[PDB]
Amino acid sequence: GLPVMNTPGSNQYLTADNFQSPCALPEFDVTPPIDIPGEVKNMMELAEIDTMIPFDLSAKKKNTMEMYRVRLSDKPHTDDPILCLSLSPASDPRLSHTMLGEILNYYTHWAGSLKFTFLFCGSMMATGKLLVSYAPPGADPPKKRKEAMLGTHVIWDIGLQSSCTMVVPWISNTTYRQTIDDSFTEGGYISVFYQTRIVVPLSTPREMDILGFVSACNDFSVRLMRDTTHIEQKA
Amino acid sequence: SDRVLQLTLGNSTITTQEAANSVVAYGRWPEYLRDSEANPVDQPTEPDVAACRFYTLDTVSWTKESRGWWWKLPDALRDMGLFGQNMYYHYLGRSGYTVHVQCNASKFHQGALGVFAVPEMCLAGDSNTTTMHTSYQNANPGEKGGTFTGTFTPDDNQTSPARRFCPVDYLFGNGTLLGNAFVFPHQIINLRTNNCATLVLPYVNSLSIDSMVKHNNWGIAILPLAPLNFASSPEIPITLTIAPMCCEFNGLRNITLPRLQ
Amino acid sequence: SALTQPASVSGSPGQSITISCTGTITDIGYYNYVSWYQQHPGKAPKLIIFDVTNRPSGVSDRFSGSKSGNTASLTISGLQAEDEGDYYCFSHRSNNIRVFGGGTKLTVL
Amino acid sequence: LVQSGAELKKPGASVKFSCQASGFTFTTYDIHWVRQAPGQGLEWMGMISPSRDSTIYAQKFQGRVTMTSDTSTSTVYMELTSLRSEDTALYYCATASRPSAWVFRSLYTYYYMDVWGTGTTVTV
Amino acid sequence: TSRDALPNTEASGPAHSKEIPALTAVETGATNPLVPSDTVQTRHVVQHRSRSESSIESFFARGACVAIITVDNSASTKNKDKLFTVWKITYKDTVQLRRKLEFFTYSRFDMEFTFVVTANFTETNNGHALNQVYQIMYVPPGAPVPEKWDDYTWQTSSNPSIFYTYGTAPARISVPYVGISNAYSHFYDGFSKVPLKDQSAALGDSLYGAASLNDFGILAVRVVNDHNPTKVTSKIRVYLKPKHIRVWCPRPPRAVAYYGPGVDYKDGTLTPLSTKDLTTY
Amino acid sequence: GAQVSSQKVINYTTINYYRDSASNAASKQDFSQDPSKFTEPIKDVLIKTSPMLN
């Protein structure tokens, strides 16, 4: 017999090994595959698809259809923010239940640019301009437009083309950010401000709604799997 | 230009002046069965022009209080002409679908519809006491479809169960959050932007061909993302028009008479 | 609601006689927790067949069971005078509800 | 061996039931109640599970029947809060201890009722 | 094009032109395929990050538990039969693997079983027990399910079976793609039978969603040993590890808690989100 | 008849000992694809610098 020596890790069961095993059903004739449309090869193909942010989350309106709608109005101009996002895609309670939030909840580390896209659902007569801004962390969060002007921003004109995209650049200290709320790798702040009010003529609705979407760019990656925290099983 | 579009299928033609560019779902145009994938040996019937034409379902009315609507394919086409008769006479069949939704409104109206194409659009039942109990009469409603509801309410009377769906709108009728439904093939009818949407759906299934009477392949969900409001409740109609593409039937038998009274 | 059973079955000794329990698509048709019980008059019930075809100890081999679709049947081969009494079907509704049968009285002629 | 309570007769008002069992069967297994009206056949009332103190009630009985447990005396109690003339019946307390081979869900085992008490006739 | 680096960010200068990458139409259903060099003044950077860990075969590499099944070896003097156990093979009763598989509508995968067995005593000791041997029999659909622990069907004429001795490494076996279709169907929007106007109501009924009543067959486990003088009880944990997996139609992940085999949801628990504020970072 | 492949950091050697294909190790080395079939499913080509609607 060939002399052999057993290493540590013999007779263990590793739940992520790549060993061979004998077949219970030898000489099995497998059904051939067919050209079913839609085959994915990477989970990041799913992350690059736009999905809608639940913005509102107020106690009166949460877990209803209203949570997706940000209500604008023709009120006189004020530098108060329209909406505020925490930009921690797996741990922000808004962003976590997006598809990107779910995939990044199945992973520990993430990197890459994020597309933020807003869609205007008001009348065609309605016009106006919105300042969509991103602030890298390490500063006071922007509560007035004068602070938010200094960051990365796009001024979106609501014309015949209905939607505009702000791509948040990958400004980070680490190569990968963590998917939990630890301050060492916090993502910053994203906010939308009125750059002049939405003006609308008579015999129109005075209130109108916008919808927002998130997706990754092609420079996006994840690298470490984990169990998701959303689901739970009783008894 | 790109806003204008003409779709010609059979003797029907649809012309729209404010269309978005049409979506070919999952990047695949509908096709007939290839020789390398055909499981049955009997000669398939390809009725072509006799079935590949645009059929218009019932027109739903959109209001302030409206929560949304859903349909099943090919179930909604079961009353529509030779396609319905071929469904009732053949054991196996397959077809792609061109789904065209028309919703016209003035420049002063506002609102947005999401038109979602869902493969295997299963829906939750009313009965919290008995899973999977929805009857064939209630699960396949035909051309009139069904309506989503804003709140869940189980039937208390177990002595005579309703056995019907209770689809909660924000849970997409299946327990998945509405904001993630955009991973499905979709187009948005925004009343300021476009008056119509066009989805071309390939035949997707785990089998090369399947029993259309037993199994619904695609579901179409129309959900108001932004509510319709207009200076005043307003009402505007939504018309749904479906045309089969590359239809192919096999296994001719006696006519099935499903109990639907 | 309850599982359906015939009201009464009659026969002479030495015959082979079956009693049938028919339920909905749930109970017998999906869950294999189908059981039969016996009750002599004035006595407490006693289990005769616990899983679909399985007998407890102390039950004679002349009792037998089978399942087909929404219907399960208890077959007694070589009926005897001591077997006269009530017989009850019992099974499980799809989510944590238990349901008995209507019962059958077996008369040995 | 399982010991059943007393037999009572008062109409309209509530009636309480008692069912005492050995400690091993009390701690380990669920306990069921079954109603037997004269000639009408067995009808399931509910389940008490003193290993976790969870209870499940039948839909015909949910508005009237409550159940409770006593770990000190290894005894469970059932109270019918209101009784109709139909409720005049013999009532049975049964402990389920015969295990099924089939795995229930994928994480539990199923017990059929196999040990039966003497029972109690109650008149309304 | 498997584990290679992601595309590098090209340097972009300031621009003043009619080209408008920033504007888009979500109504078309397309997602605007922008890179950061299209809207901000990017520098050049060679990107070393990959996408290997986000592949489908990487995503399903971790094995998951599906069942915890109980057997015993009853004390010889006691009346009650030895509890063998019998399990309908499905993934739909454990939430984690179900939630991961329900990301997609259709799948093919080879299936690597792994069985871990743990035993314990249940009495005041009164005599120890020797090292037990466990038989794990695969029962394909329509084959006779055992009625007793010493039934004739345990003789293993054609069924595959695994004999495991306690204290050894956990037993592993692989089964190929066993599904009758060209892919597994995680969801089935249909019925097994159609009710017809000629048939009675009791005969035409069918479960919704349930494509078949016995999908992949039955596992049966028993203790081979005779009745020990004192009771020993053991639990078997079955672990599923998909191999060579291909998946075909994406879906939103399940948000609300599960209920039964179908897509139904329980009353009351329909509140996935939690309270926050629109204007609070 | 072994298979030799390079590790991403050097080679590693694999031999398939069982003749049934289900027995094999997951070889990884899985090809990636263009996400256009889910991200850009429209009929006409999306030239990204152009206005999307004309």
Numbering used by the authors:
A (entry chain 3): 1 to 235
B (entry chain 2): 10 to 241, 244 to 272
C (entry chain L): 21 to 129
D (entry chain H): 23 to 146
E (entry chain 1): 22 to 302
F (entry chain 4): 2 to 10, 25 to 69
Sentences from the paper on this structure:
In support of this goal, we map the epitope of human monoclonal antibody 9H2 which is able to neutralize the three serotypes of poliovirus. Here, we solved the high-resolution structures of 9H2 fragments of antibody binding (Fab) complexed with live and inactivated poliovirus serotypes 1, 2, and 3 capsids. For each of the Fab-virus complexes, we find that the binding site overlaps with the poliovirus receptor (PVR) binding site and maps across and into a depression in the capsid called the canyon. Thus, 9H2 outcompetes the receptor to neutralize poliovirus.
To make complexes, 9H2 antibody fragments (Fab) were generated and purified from the mAb and incubated in excess with virus capsids of wild-type PV1 and 2 (WTPV1, WTPV2), Sabin PV3 (SPV3), and Sabin inactivated PV1, 2, and 3 (SIPV1, SIPV2, SIPV3). A Fab model was calculated by submitting the 9H2 amino acid sequence to the SabPred AbodyBuilder38. This 9H2 model initiated the build that was guided by the presence of disulfide bond density visible in the WTPV2, SPV3, SIPV1, and SIPV2 complex maps. Strong pocket factor density, equal in magnitude to capsid density was observed in both inactivated and live types 2 and 3 virus-Fab complexes; however, there was no PF density resolved at any contour level in either the inactivated or live type 1 virus-Fab complexes. The 9H2 footprint overlaps that of PVR but seems to trigger pocket factor release only from serotype 1, indicating that 9H2 lacks contacts essential to PVR function in serotypes 2 and 3. For types 1 and 2, the live wild-type virus superimposed with inactivated Sabin with a Cα-RMSD of 0.3 and 0.3, respectively. Inactivated virus footprints are not significantly different than the corresponding live serotype although we cannot assess the contact details completely within the disordered VP1 loop 96–103. There are no significant structural differences between the live and inactive virus particles of each serotype. For each inactive virus footprint, the most similar contacts are found in the corresponding live virus. This finding suggests that the inactive virus particle would have similar immunogenicity and could generate cross-neutralizing antibodies as a live vaccine.
